[PDB]
């Protein structure tokens, strides 16, 4: 069975049904990309999948259990990236990444920042970092985590083409092993249609 099952989701926001009765089970090691339109619920589906929002109808199933008692095991195997980066801007990149697990010594730090394209930009504060580099600091987390489930809303935004290529390569290496990445981007990512799976919004 899939360890992420979204069942009978209904989302009504100001007399509009974004999605009603949406259901999908995600088996191990695959590449869901949530599509939609500007003004459709392809965030309030990822956010609801993380458990931040309580569903109006339906629910989210993790390993055969609902999301309100297995929180300690669910938050240990998830990596969420949002529109906001989630990093303290007043610090530098080093302690901002050292908040999250590993980092520190050179085995997991100073090379996960280097693989994201921030070589020589480790001890500079995030206030004078560029917006693309500000999101690159948060997106460098993929190279040091062990989280099986990745949920990334708009990863490839304000990022140059080499960055998108490296991110898709790292995501492919995570996809070949046991791990599910759920992204939502507008541009077509340069990958074959055969491995990516499109769960479209229905109305």
């Amino acid at each position: 069975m899939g360890m992420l099952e979204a069942r009978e989701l209904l989302c009504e926001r100001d007399e509009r049904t974004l999605f009603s009765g949406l259901s999908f089970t995600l088996n191990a090691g695959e590449w869901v990309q949530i599509t939609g339109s500007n003004g459709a619920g392809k965030t309030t589906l990822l956010r609801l999948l993380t458990g931040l929002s309580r569903p109006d109808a339906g629910e989210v199933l993790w390993q055969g259990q609902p999301l309100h008692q297995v929180r300690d095991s669910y938050h240990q195997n998830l990596l969420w990236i949002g529109h906001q980066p989630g990093i303290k801007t007043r610090l530098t990149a080093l302690e901002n990444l050292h908040f999250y697990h590993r980092d520190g010594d050179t085995a997991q730090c100073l090379e996960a920042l280097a693989q994201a394209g921030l070589a020589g930009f480790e001890d500079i504060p995030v206030n004078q970092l560029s917006a693309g580099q500000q999101r690159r600091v948060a997106l460098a987390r993929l190279w040091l985590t062990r989280a099986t489930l990745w949920i990334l809303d708009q990863p490839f935004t304000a990022i140059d083409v080499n960055g998108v290529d490296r991110l898709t390569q790292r995501m492919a290496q995570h996809t070949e092993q046991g791990g599910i990445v759920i992204l939502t981007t507008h541009q077509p990512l340069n990958v074959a249609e055969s491995k990516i799976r499109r769960i479209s919004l229905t109305q």
Binding site: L52, H75, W80, H83, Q84, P85, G86, I87, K88
Partner: peptide, 15 residues
């Protein structure tokens, strides 16, 4: 909130 780190603080493996 405006930074956005409180969401990932809520997603941290700790109550």
């Amino acid at each position: 909130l405006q930074d956005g780190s409180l969401e990932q603080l809520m997603l941290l493996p700790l109550p």
